[PDB]
């Protein structure tokens, strides 16, 4: 069950590149593309993300997309730069200028067909393609505009395949331009319709974690991406390694998404660590469980106590007492059963992987479909309305052929998504 990876824009390619370099180490794949591991657990499901090639080298089933070559050139010169299939580098030259309209309608429309040709060539090699995963930001133009454009066209050509996304949310705490709420609201409108699963990676959360918890005075995008790549490695563990779960992108959707539009997940991770700073003391199972459920460990800046969990998936990694984990996970649901909906029996599920991530002897990844996620979209909505009520910076979009109506439509649907989440919070 192969997955086709796509990474669009500056952010998408940078978190995408780190994602591959992380799991490549976990599967014993070196930058050359050669396997040098000690366990065969690493290879049993390596085909989900990697293609087997000449000399039995493993090539990532990844497609790198951008409207400017700047960031993709950095990837190619990066650590695991040469592992990628060079034909899967599809890029323009004009950029998107952090404009959703340029990525979705003008600049991106000119390049999108080239990308889909690569998507097709990769899919035809799949024994049985299960779906796509996309890495991108929502605050920019390419990953945001062209990313959602790609999603729309991928759904057209592969309507029976699962669409998964790692969508990075914009925040004033980590901002490139003021028009990020515009691009984000427009993108969310697309994600609600054309994805089955979306990991909400909030930059506001990633900043706070770096500042408050990790005590990093002035965090960079590199610091932020340590958290992303750690989370991405965690939420894909069940896909990359064999398990009781028999996990794929569809089973995840069926079990996590009780209602199709409400498919925006809160990722979490424990232990929170900074780059370079290695742990010496391992976390006890009670500590992993407590932390992974704490708001301070959530990659989406939302208070889970302000809502209810529809579903939860917790992935423990490393060698540990699976009994103790079950005792702690059952303790979780029994200590605060009020924050779990009573109308979905046994909505919290646990999985284990013997292989831990690099630098940690054990860890815990959290995937929650909470109704508290509305706080995220409400935040974007307020920032959106603040500008939109005065039609500020809108000329950047109308100059690309967009009409005000389309903004109002995107706004309304996101507000609907909020109310929809509020609906089941009072059930």
């Amino acid at each position: 069950r192969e997955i086709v990876h796509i990474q669009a824009g500056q952010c998408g390619n940078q978190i995408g590149a780190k994602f591959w370099e992380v799991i490549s180490d976990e599967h014993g794949i070196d930058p050359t593309g050669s396997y040098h591991g000690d366990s065969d657990l690493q290879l049993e499901r390596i085909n989900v993300y990697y293609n087997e090639a000449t000399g039995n080298k493993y090539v990532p089933r990844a497609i790198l997309v951008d409207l400017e070559p700047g960031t993709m050139d950095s990837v190619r010169s990066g650590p695991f730069g040469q592992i990628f299939r060079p034909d899967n580098f599809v890029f323009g030259q004009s950029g998107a200028g952090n404009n959703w309209a340029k990525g979705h309608y003008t600049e991106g429309a000119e390049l999108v067909d080239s990308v889909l040709d690569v998507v097709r060539k990769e899919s035809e090699s799949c024994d049985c393609l299960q779906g796509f995963q996309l890495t991108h930001s929502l605050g920019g133009g390419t990953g945001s505009g062209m990313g959602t454009l790609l999603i729309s066209k991928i759904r057209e050509e592969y309507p029976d395949r699962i669409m998964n996304t790692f969508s990075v949310m914009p925040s004033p705490k980590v901002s490139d331009t003021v028009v990020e709420p515009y691009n984000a609201t427009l993108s969310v409108h697309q994600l609600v319709e054309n994805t089955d699963e979306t990991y909400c990676i909030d930059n506001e959360a990633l900043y706070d974690i770096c500042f408050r918890t990790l005590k990093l005075t002035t965090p960079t995008y590199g610091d932020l991406n340590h958290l992303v790549s750690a989370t991405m490695s965690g939420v894909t563990t069940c896909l990359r390694f064999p398990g009781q779960l028999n996990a794929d992108l569809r089973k995840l959707a069926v079990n996590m998404v009780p209602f199709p539009r409400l498919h925006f997940f809160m990722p979490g991770f424990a232990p929170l660590t900074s780059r370079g700073s290695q742990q010496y003391r391992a976390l006890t199972v009670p500590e992993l469980t407590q932390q992974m459920f704490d708001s301070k460990n959530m990659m989406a800046a939302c208070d889970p106590r302000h809502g209810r969990y529809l579903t939860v998936a917790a992935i423990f990694r490393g060698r540990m007492s699976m009994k103790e984990v079950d005792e702690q996970m059952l303790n979780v649901q029994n200590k605060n059963s009020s924050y779990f909906v009573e109308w979905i029996p046994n909505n919290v599920k646990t999985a284990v992987c013997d292989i831990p991530p690099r630098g940690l002897k054990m860890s815990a990844t959290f995937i929650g479909n909470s109704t508290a996620i509305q706080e995220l979209f409400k935040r974007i909505s307020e920032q959106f309305t603040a500008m939109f009520r005065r039609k500020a910076f809108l000329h950047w979009y109308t100059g690309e052929g967009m009409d005000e109506m389309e903004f109002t439509e995107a706004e309304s649907n996101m507000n609907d998504l909020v109310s929809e989440y509020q609906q089941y919070q009072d059930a």
Binding site: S152, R155, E156, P159, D160
Partner: protein, 54 residues
């Protein structure tokens, strides 16, 4: 109390003890049901592709 119909063999034996006395769809019906659901899938997929065409 009452043991009845005792039957012994080389592999074993069986009996019965009483303590107290007392006081489909057709083939095409199926295939139409399956095809009816398939048409509902194609309609759903058509409404999608039509919406995407817009």
């Amino acid at each position: 109390m009452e043991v009845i119909e005792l039957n012994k063999c080389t592999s074993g034996q069986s009996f019965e003890v009483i303590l107290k006395p007392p006081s489909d769809p057709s083939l095409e019906e199926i295939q139409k049901k399956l095809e009816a659901a398939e048409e509902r899938r194609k309609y759903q997929e058509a409404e999608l592709l039509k919406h995407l065409a817009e």
